[model samples]
Structures are given as C-alpha cells and as structure tokens.
Target: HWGYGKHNGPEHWHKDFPIAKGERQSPVDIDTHTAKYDPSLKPLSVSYDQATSLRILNNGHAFNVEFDDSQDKAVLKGGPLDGTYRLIQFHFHWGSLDGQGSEHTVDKKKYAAELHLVHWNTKYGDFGKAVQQPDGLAVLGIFLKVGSAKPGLQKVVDVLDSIKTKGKSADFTNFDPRGLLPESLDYWTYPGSLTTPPLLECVTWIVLKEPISVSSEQVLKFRKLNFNGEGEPEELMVDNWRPAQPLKNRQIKASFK
Candidate 1:
C-alpha cells in the first residue's frame, strides 16, 4: 500500500482489497529501451481561431478548460493525419498545494504539470455518439515545467483571479490554442488506457519527449484550484492526476532515433 502523507497522499486506494492482481494492477512505469516502437504514427494538427473562448468549468474536480465544440471537431476528426479521434473536451490534472502536477513521471522525476487534450474517436459519429464506443478516446499529453515565461499562457492564467476559489470559472478572453503545444512534436507513442477512474484501456498515448516552460508561479495558480459548492468547501480537490499505471505488456512507439 502507498503512503498518504502530504507528498505521499492517496496511498490507501486499494488496501488489501480482494481482486485479481492483473485486474487491479495499474499501467504505471514503462520501460521503453529495447522495446518495439512504431515511428509512422503522425502528430495531429490543430488550428487557432481569432475568438476561441477558453471557458472554464467547475466539474467538481478542478477548474478545467471547456473546449470549444466547433473548433475541436474541425481540427481533429478523420483528417489526413490518420487520426480517427475528435476533440471531446479539454481538462487538466494537478497536484496538492505544492507544484507536482503530472500523472506520469519519466525516470521517476515529476514535472510541474500535465495538460491533457482529450479527443474521442469519431468512428461512430461525433463526440457525443462516439464516446459510447469501446475504443473512442485518445489523449495528447503535454508536460509543463518551470522555464522561461510564456506570454501566451499568461493569458489563460490571468483568469485565475476570477475563478480562484473552487467551483468558480470565468471566460479566458483572446487566447490562441496553438500556443499550448510543445515545440517538438517528436513523441513516444503506446497502446494504453485512460488515467482516470473507470479506467478504460483504449487510448493511443502520445507523450512528447520534449516539455514546455511555465513560471513556477503559474504552476502555483493551478494548485490554487479546488472543488467548491454552496456549502463549505469539500476536501481540497487539488491534484487531479493519477499515478502512472503499469505497462501491462504494452510496447511504446517513438518518432526519434
């Protein structure tokens, strides 16, 4: 069992619970060296709109970005990139009051944050209909850490003042979506499952080898988010990331040598 300390919280999820090890075990740390990899899976393309509002939503977890319905579909579904998925919505995962924000760590080093751009396969139809399909989800992983300050991201964080408390959200005005991607599209791909509860194992995980820079203060802003209601605040719904799951005989693919 894991420890539930300040840094080591959520340690008691499965305390001697009865179940098959394989069924309950997670796909966390994976070894990529000497592993089979596919290099042809191309990166999906995204477009920026002059007026794509970054609407924040209170989904009882943390304050997440409400994706524009029209913009996500136009850029993701049945495109030349061999991508079968369409953007369903966008959300984020963070850590406790501190800075650790990502669900997956490379070589045991935790980055400041992880941003998930969720997309569902449009095979059945659109996002609403396709989400019901067994294999209808794909997530793009973007690692965030402290580096040089990014002005584009500042626009998004500026809204934190309005939605600082839990269950509060405001519109992020005049921001471009393209500013969120890491400069290097070179990524490590693999067959994996969702990192959340009801964990479904049906996503083509594309984790970028390179990460982007954000100010430590910016990461602090994300930690400030919590789940709020009309009554007193609930347990601070701070960190939204799940710990890395087991590899489960899965091979990761990469586009680099």
Candidate 2:
C-alpha cells in the first residue's frame, strides 16, 4: 500500500500509480494575483441533512466522516459545477507541526490544516462510477489556521480519543457540516486530481478563500492518532499530505477578486 512515509511517499507514488505525475495532479499553489476572476461563477449552494451522517472512521491515511449518498439528502450545486454532487465523505490532511500542514497553499503559504469534503456527481449513478468520469467529483476545500478554539469542530474532536488507532470507528451523527464553513463562500475554482493515489483527474476543486480557526491544542490532537492498528507498531499519523504539484497550463478561476 502507498503512504506518506519515506519509502512509499509522494516521490515514489508515481512509480506505482502512474497518474501521480499526470498533468492534472492536485494540491497546486494558488497565486491569487494570477488567478482569473470569473463573474459567471455561481454562488455555492449546499444543503445537508444531518440525519444522513453515519459514522466516522480512521482509515490509516486519514479520519473520514462518512455520509449516506444513496439519495440527494446532502448535495452541492452551482459554483463551477455542471450537475448536483452528493456528499460522500469529509476528511482532513495535516502535519505534525503548525503553519505547514495543508495540502494546497495560497501565495506559496501553507496553512495549519486542510479539510476535504468529497462529493460525487449523481448523474453518473454512484461514486465508484462517477470517480472515473471527467466531471465526476467536486471537492470543497477548507483551510484551517491556528487561532481560537472552534466550537463547531469540537464535536468531531471529542470522538478522536475513541478512534486513536487505525481501523477504528465510532458512531457520529446529528452534525451539520455547514457549521464548519466560513462566513464567506468566495473561492478559487480549478480542475485537479485527488491528492491521494489513483490520482484521478476528475475533480472540480472549489477552494475557499477564507479560512476557519482551530486552536493549537486541537490541532495537536490529530498527531496523537496512529497509522497502525492495535497489534502493529504505532506510527504517528501526521504530515499525511501531498506537496503542491505543478499547475501545468490550467487556469485557476476565482469567484471574486
């Protein structure tokens, strides 16, 4: 399996997953000055039913909050998208240190952490099928900075103790993801691939310009988790993020100047 460690890290991922070096690879640096402003971009429309939230799982790579995508209960529309995309899951990428963990950066500056809300196009039927198409996925990227405690995220942090090891999971419900978003929906849009392997170039990335706040104490909690399960040697799960890839010839369009 691939990992973010020395042996199977991003540098070697291209060997196994050929698409790692693809032209549309993700986590590109967004130079705001160079980004084009598109007035035609629609406001992001998000609707979520907390009842669809099922459980949270520690999948070794990251902690994911899975949602029931069987129906259009939680969907994202507009904002540089062609059709409705149902929320599949939400996860994060971070490092062991502060001010240097996020996968994507703006003006070459990295943030403390990053959250990815993955959604798959419903027009293609299911995530498995949609992920292969050109316009199959829409990932909402939210940056997190070190600041005051975020009560909105406390619900998720509270359950970290129970899932300290890989393969562990717990029941998590009654949480609306909208609470985690920033006040402004203004963002930068681009075409990119999944930061993780298979590195599918199928995502319509909508990265928010505004960042949410999380305390240093809360940020450190992510490092306490392990990459290994109960029986294996514990490996701290931190710095599990891919570095920024080349932007190639793609233009990053901003909803606002």
Scored by lDDT, the top model is 2
lDDT of 2 by residue, 139-202 (tens): 9999999999888888888899899888999998777788789999999999999999889999
Query: After TM-score superposition, what is the CA distance of residue 174 in candidate 2 from its true location, in Å?
Result: 1.6
Model 1 agreement with the true structure over 86-167: per-residue lDDT tens digits = 5545666766643576776776666677777777665656665644444666667778878777667777777766775556
Worst-scoring 10-residue span by lDDT in model 2: 45-54
Worst 10 residues of 1 by lDDT: 17-26
Residue 255 in model 1: lDDT: 64
lDDT (C-alpha, whole model) for all candidates = 0.59, 0.91
Q: Estimate the overall C-alpha local distance difference test score of candidate 2.
A: 0.91
Off by over 4 Å in 1: 1-27, 30-35, 48-51, 70-74, 77-82, 97-99, 230-237
Global lDDT of model 1: 0.59
